[PDB]
Amino acid sequence: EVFEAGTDGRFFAYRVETFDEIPFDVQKFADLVTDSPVISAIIDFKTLK
């Protein structure tokens, strides 16, 4: 499962196998992003879908 945030204020949660948006779970994106590797969204969700 992919969580995504943007400085513009756009956030997206989705699944890797199929790119369908998911209810964004704040307080889980934060715990993931404080420690785990963070990936720049060159090909951000909208382009991926």
Partner: protein, 396 residues
């Protein structure tokens, strides 16, 4: 769903009625239904769990029938029936938990767990019998597309929102005019405040309006309307609209003037109540329009006249209010309320087994988020899980 409910109802009846010493004439039909359940479920393999921390469990049904002849039930009959009922109740509880923790964007009304999908086959229709509960009755009626009605005591229809609107404001926040409200559960408190007390308003009357859009149509609603909003009637340091600073509120409560409560459906006035406080009835509505006026008292005693000077500073700020409580209502769609425990049951089951956030419901089944965006798919999934929760509550 009807088959699962029938299993649960048969087990509940078996627990309640198959007791030591009772006449067999009291349970003859119940024993026949129980035997039909045994026959239908025999030779079937079921699997439950596998989502979150919900454990995988396999169920195989091979039970004999109850066919002993008696006048009054004895300990042997009760013990055998108890063993069978215990196994079946465990199976039904696990199936209900499995179905409660699942959702789908498409066809969320349809069964999600493979156990319930298997139970939805034609071969199991024999298990089906009396469907008398409110939730199963509504389920069957909606399957037939007849009108369905869920009766709620204090429906949880308004998502939590403590907000304010400033119709007149300035950086110092010393001469403000606006409204502040709390919409929570079945309660709507609104307070219109004017710092100048309508000294320069046309006819010394200020007008405040609060429009609340219900996410679902409520019918046969009993409402209690009270003049004052006690929540917005004490001194308060409130944040700025953008949080840049904080302003001061020092209410002095004047009675609301020219109160009109309009209960609207599709923008059409269904019910209107003018200067009526106490118990009122809104027969069918989806919007509430509370319009009330702050009227500067034409005649003031010296103590009152001291509070409202002609010009600034305004140390005391005039405030009118309104409190609206929906004591009871009827809604075609399911909702949380103060008397039922279905939302609590589903949330507890999802939290206990660490169910991952799905594609329909918000994280943690936050009711405010759910009712704010109460979409048709969310409504279907919520109805499904609430029906399953009631079925489970019949036993567990």
């Amino acid at each position: 769903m009807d088959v699962l409910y029938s299993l649960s109802k048969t087990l509940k009846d078996a627990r309640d009625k198959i007791v030591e010493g009772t006449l067999y004439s009291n349970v003859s039909d119940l024993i026949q239904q129980f035997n039909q359940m045994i026959i239908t479920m025999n030779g079937n393999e079921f699997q439950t769990g596998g989502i979150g921390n919900l454990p995988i469990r396999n169920w195989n049904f091979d039970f004999g029938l109850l066919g002993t002849t008696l006048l009054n039930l004895d300990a042997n009959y009760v013990e055998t029936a108890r063993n069978t009922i215990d196994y079946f109740v465990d199976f039904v509880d696990n199936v209900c938990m499995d179905e409660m923790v699942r959702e789908s964007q498409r066809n969320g009304i349809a069964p999600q767990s493979d156990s319930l999908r298997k139970l939805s086959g034609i071969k199991f229709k024999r298990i089906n019998f009396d469907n008398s509960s409110e939730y199963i009755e509504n389920w069957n009626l909606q399957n037939r597309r007849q009108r369905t009605g869920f009766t709620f005591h204090k429906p949880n229809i308004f998502p939590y929102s403590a907000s304010f609107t400033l119709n007149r404001s300035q950086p110092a926040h010393d001469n403000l005019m606006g409204t502040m409200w709390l919409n929570a559960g079945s309660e709507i408190q609104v307070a219109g405040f004017d710092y100048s007390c309508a000294i320069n308003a046309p006819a010394n009357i200020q007008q405040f309006e609060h429009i609340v859009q219900l996410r679902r149509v409520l019918t046969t609603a009993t409402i209690t309307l009270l003049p004052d909003a006690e929540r917005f009637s004490f001194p308060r340091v409130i944040n700025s609209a953008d949080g840049a600073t904080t302003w001061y509120f020092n209410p002095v409560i004047l009675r609301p003037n020219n109160v009109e409560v309009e209960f609207l459906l599709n923008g059409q006035i269904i019910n209107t109540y003018q200067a009526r406080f106490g118990t009122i009835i809104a027969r069918n509505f989806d919007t509430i329009r509370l319009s009330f006026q702050l009227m500067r008292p034409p005649n003031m005693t010296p103590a009152v006249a001291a509070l409202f000077p002609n010009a600034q500073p305004f140390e005391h700020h005039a405030t009118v209010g309104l409190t609206l409580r929906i004591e009871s209502a009827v809604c075609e769609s399911v909702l949380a309320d103060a008397s039922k425990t279905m939302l609590a049951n589903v949330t507890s089951v999802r939290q206990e087994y660490a169910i991952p956030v799905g594609p329909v419901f918000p994280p943690g089944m936050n009711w405010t988020d759910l009712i704010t965006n109460y979409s048709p798919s969310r409504e279907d999934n919520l109805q499904r899980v609430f029906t399953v929760a009631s079925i489970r509550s019949m036993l567990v």
